[PDB]
Each structure stands twice: as structure tokens, then as C-alpha cells.
Amino acid sequence: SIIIRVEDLRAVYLVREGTIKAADGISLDILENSVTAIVGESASGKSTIIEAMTKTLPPNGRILSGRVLYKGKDLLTMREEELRKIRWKEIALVPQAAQQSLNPTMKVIEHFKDTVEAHGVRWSHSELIEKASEKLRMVRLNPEAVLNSYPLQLSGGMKQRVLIALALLLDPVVLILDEPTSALDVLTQAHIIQLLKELKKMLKITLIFVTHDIAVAAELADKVAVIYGGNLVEYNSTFQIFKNPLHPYTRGLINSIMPIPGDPPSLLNPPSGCRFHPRCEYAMEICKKEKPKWIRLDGEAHVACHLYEE
Ligand SMILES: Nc1ncnc2c1ncn2[C@@H]1O[C@H](COP(=O)(O)OP(=O)(O)OP(=O)(O)O)[C@@H](O)[C@H]1O
Ligand code: SF4
Numbered sequence: 153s154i155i156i157r158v159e160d161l162r163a164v165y166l167v168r169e170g171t172i173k174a175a176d177g178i179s180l181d182i183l184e185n186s187v188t189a190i191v192g193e194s195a196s197g198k199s200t201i202i203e204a205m206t207k208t209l210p211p212n213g214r215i216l217s218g219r220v221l222y223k224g225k226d227l228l229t230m231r232e233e234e235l236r237k238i239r240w241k242e243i244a245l246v247p248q249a250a251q252q253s254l255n256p257t258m259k260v261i262e263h264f265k266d267t268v269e270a271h272g273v274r275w276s277h278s279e280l281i282e283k284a285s286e287k288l289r290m291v292r293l294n295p296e297a298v299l300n301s302y303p304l305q306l307s308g309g310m311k312q313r314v315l316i317a318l319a320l321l322l323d324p325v326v327l328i329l330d331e332p333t334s335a336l337d338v339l340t341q342a343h344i345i346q347l348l349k350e351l352k353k354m355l356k357i358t359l360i361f362v363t364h365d366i367a368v369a370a371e372l373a374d375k376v377a378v379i380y381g382g383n384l385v386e387y388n389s390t391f392q393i394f395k396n397p398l399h400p401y402t403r404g405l406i407n408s409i410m411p412i413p414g415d416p417p418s419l420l421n422p423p424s425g426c427r428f429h430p431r432c433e434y435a436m437e438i439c440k441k442e443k444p445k446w447i448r449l450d451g452e453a454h455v456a457c458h459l460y461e462e
């Protein structure tokens with residue numbers, strides 16, 4: 153099943169000198185119990201697509217065009233009365249360094265309460281302790297010690313565990329995670345990934361997560377979506393991506409993983425057509441005159457590249 157269809161998503165950042173065209177025309181289908189990874193280098197639009205999808209864009213960011221369908225109904229253009237029932241309950245989002253959203257003069261139990269309260273639902277404080285403890289366990293934490301401690305007393309690994317437990321609180325059907333594992337030593341990064349695998353199996357959920365490390369994606373993901381300068385450049389299954397990477401940018405990555413000449417594109421003044429052309433070794437005239445069309449190819453596979461066709 154497709155649990156989420158992103159259709160033609162244009163979302164930009166309004167800035168003094170014009171617009172920032174991160175997330176520029178973005179269409180992809182999330183399989184209903186999959187793990188999809190969104191991958192790309194620093195400052196390439198990952199968090200921007202995530203935010204656009206969740207209507208969590210800053211005051212700054214504005215959505216120009218497109219739909220996102222959950223259960224065939226468009227999240228953008230939804231009555232906030234109809235949005236509030238979908239939020240933590242169904243779709244849930246632990247965002248880039250949401251640790252910072254943990255005010256540190258507060259016991260964790262309070263960030264749970266704050267969350268629960270905010271999203272409507274009314275639970276007896278003791279009941280809340282129950283549920284919270286339960287998900288804290290799911291994430292392999294000491295419910296007692298943790299709920300009753302202050303953020304500052306927790307490791308980044310533990311803060312991360314807490315954040316996830318928080319997201320799971322209301323048994324969501326989709327869980328979305330942004331750079332879940334960055335700023336986080338090797339080992340504990342490994343433990344988070346393990347944990348993510350555990351919950352993957354132990355729960356019935358669609359899991360979308362963002363990362364800049366392809367390795368991490370292949371550790372975790374079924375399908376993989378590569379983004380380059382505000383564009384969805386390619387979308388295959390993990391194994392296929394490594395086996396048969398289509399976009400020249402992607403190929404480059406995979407090879408560079410067995411160090412690509414060029415600098416990343418200005419997102420204010422991007423290059424024309426295919427933003428990868430200035431670095432692409434297969435660059436052509438049509439590549440500068442025209443944005444390659446997002447296309448379907450063979451099986452799970454999608455590319456946006458002039459080299460290819462139906
Ligand atoms: N509120 C904003 N206003 C203007 N520009 C922004 C805003 N937020 C992000 N950008 C810019 O748009 C580009 C894409 O940012 P985004 O956060 O989507 O990248 P990313 O893929 O998350 O990479 P990273 O997370 O490592 O920064 C970046 O250059 C970023 O600085
Ligand atoms: S579209 Fe043209 S430039 Fe962009 S990657 Fe495919 S070939 Fe290289």
C-alpha cells in the first residue's frame with residue numbers, strides 16, 4: 153500500500169534577496185510498512201522536505217505547490233480540526249536536534265506531559281506515567297530514573313531514546329526522524345540504529361528517516377531517496393541503489409564509497425535544468441536548458457535524468 157503520496161512539492165524559503173529553492177518539485181511514494189531513507193549531503197533540502205511534508209516549516213518557509221496524501225487525503229489544505237487528530241496520533245516527527253526543544257529545568261516527565269497536553273488527549277498523571285514508562289521500556293530505558301531526571305543529566309544517546317519514546321507515545325502509524333543519529337559517537341549511533349531495527353520489527357509502522365550517511369541508510373532502509381540541491385534525483389530499493397545506481401550523482405556517491413569534483417549549488421541562484429550538470433561528467437545541452445523529468449523506469453526505480461526514459 154502507499155501510505156503517503158508526495159505529489160509535486162515545491163517549498164521555498166522567503167529571503168531578502170529572493171527565494172531559497174530547497175525542496176523544488178518533489179514527488180515520491182512511501183510504501184505502507186517500509187523504511188524509506190532520505191539521503192543527501194549537508195544543506196541539500198532533506199530537513200526542508202521533511203518539514204514541508206509535516207507542515208512544520210518555519211515562519212520563513214512557504215509552500216508554493218503540490219499535495220501530500222495520507223489515506224488519499226491531502227494534509228496540506230486540511231482543516232486544522234482534522235489535522236489535530238492526525239498529528240501525534242497517526243504521524244509523528246522527531247525533528248533535527250529536537251533535543252534543543254527540551255528545556256532543561258524540567259524533568260522529562262514534564263516534556264511528556266507538555267506533549268500529551270498540547271496534542272489534546274487527557275490522561276491521569278499516573279496513567280501518563282504508565283504509558284510513558286511503557287514506551288521508555290520499548291526504547292530500553294529505565295522509566296523510573298529517566299522520567300524523574302533533567303535533560304542535562306542525559307547523554308545524547310539517551311536524549312535521543314527519550315525523543316523517540318515521546319514520538320511513539322500515542323502509537324503512530326508513521327514515524328519520521330531527521331538526522332536521528334548525527335552529533336553522536338560511533339558506538340551509540342550504532343545502538344540507536346539497532347534500536348530502530350528492533351522497533352521496525354516489533355511494531356507495525358511506516359518509518360521515514362533522514363540521514364547524510366548512505367551506510368546508515370543501507371543499514372536500515374528498504375527504499376532510498378537521494379536528494380541533490382533541492383531536487384529528488386533518484387529513488388530505488390537499497391540493494392538496487394548499490395547494485396545499479398542510476399543518477400550520475402548517485403553513481404558518484406556509491407563509487408566514492410568503495411571526493412566528487414565540484415562545489416554544491418547555490419540554492420538561491422541554482423543552475424538551470426539539472427542542477428547537477430556543472431559537476432556531471434555526462435552533462436549535455438538539454439541538461440542546462442531543461443530539468444530532467446521525474447520518471448518511472450523498471451520496478452521500484454525512479455530517476456530524474458536526461459540519460460534515461462520510460
Ligand atoms: N529558514 C530558512 N531560511 C532561509 N534558508 C534556509 C532556512 N532553512 C534552511 N535554509 C537553507 O536551505 C538549504 C537547505 O536546508 P536544509 O536544512 O533542508 O538542508 P539539510 O538537507 O537539512 O542539511 P543540514 O540538515 O545538514 O543543514 C540550506 O542551505 C539552508 O541553510
Ligand atoms: S541530467 Fe544531464 S546533467 Fe543532470 S545528471 Fe543526468 S546527465 Fe548529468
Ligand SMILES: [Mg+2]
Pocket residue numbers: 198199248330331362
Ligand atoms: Mg537534515
